Amino acid sequence: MKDRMKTVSVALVLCLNVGVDPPDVVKTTPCARLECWIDPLSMGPQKAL
Amino acid sequence: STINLQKAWGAARRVSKDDWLEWLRRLSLELLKDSSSPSLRSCWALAQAYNPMARDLFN
Amino acid sequence: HTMVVQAITFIFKSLGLKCVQFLPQVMPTFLNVIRVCDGAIREFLFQQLGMLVSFVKSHIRPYMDEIVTLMREFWVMNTSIQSTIILL
Numbered sequence: 001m002k003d004r005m006k007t008v009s010v011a012l013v014l015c016l017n018v019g020v021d022p023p024d025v026v027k028t029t030p031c032a033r034l035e036c037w038i039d040p041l042s043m044g045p046q047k048a049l
Numbered sequence: 050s051t052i053n054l055q056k057a058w059g060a061a062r063r064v065s066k067d068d069w070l071e072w073l074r075r076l077s078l079e080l081l082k083d084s085s086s087p088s089l090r091s092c093w094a095l096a097q098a099y100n101p102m103a104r105d106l107f108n
Numbered sequence: 109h110t111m112v113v114q115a116i117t118f119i120f121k122s123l124g125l126k127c128v129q130f131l132p133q134v135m136p137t138f139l140n141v142i143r144v145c146d147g148a149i150r151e152f153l154f155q156q157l158g159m160l161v162s163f164v165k166s167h168i169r170p171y172m173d174e175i176v177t178l179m180r181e182f183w184v185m186n187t188s189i190q191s192t193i194i195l196l
Contacts, residue, residue: 088122
């Protein structure tokens with residue numbers, strides 16, 4: 001296996017923008033909300049983000 | 050869309066209880082038949098059969 | 109009977125994905141009407157319910173148990189109602 005390679009850097013872009021739903025979506029009442037195993041609506045936007 | 054409306058408005062020749070009641074009924078039903086909002090218009094067909102339903106969409 | 113529901117459907121189709129607001133008001137009574145009526149209107153009510161479900165898509169979850177119970181009760185070898193229930 002001559003063609004060795006590696007990965008060195010990672011960039012994490014998150015377009016969350018907690019608290020507001022985009023126009024395209026209408027959501028049910030319970031709905032699915034967990035993100036990375038955190039509920040974003042139990043805190044403030046900045047802390048959750 | 051305001052020819053029947055004018056007739057319903059400017060009759061004003063009623064001389065009896067029933068005549069003025071007929072004026073009221075004609076005015077109410079006509080207002081439903083022609084309304085910008087589609088939700089109200091859809092009720093017209095029912096109002097002609099059930100009167101008590103009228104007097105509720107009048108305002 | 110007929111007009112009352114014929115209007116309601118027309119409203120939903122016109123509103124779009126905003127009729128959900130009225131689901132709690134309409135659904136509990138609607139089902140109760142199907143269980144207690146005459147053999148002359150049940151097919152029409154089932155068809156209108158199918159149209160309502162088509163308009164409402166996923167927000168029809170909490171009433172599926174009662175809907176299924178109704179379908180279970182009123183499925184019979186009669187040819188007429190079977191096609192309506194299959195389309196539903």
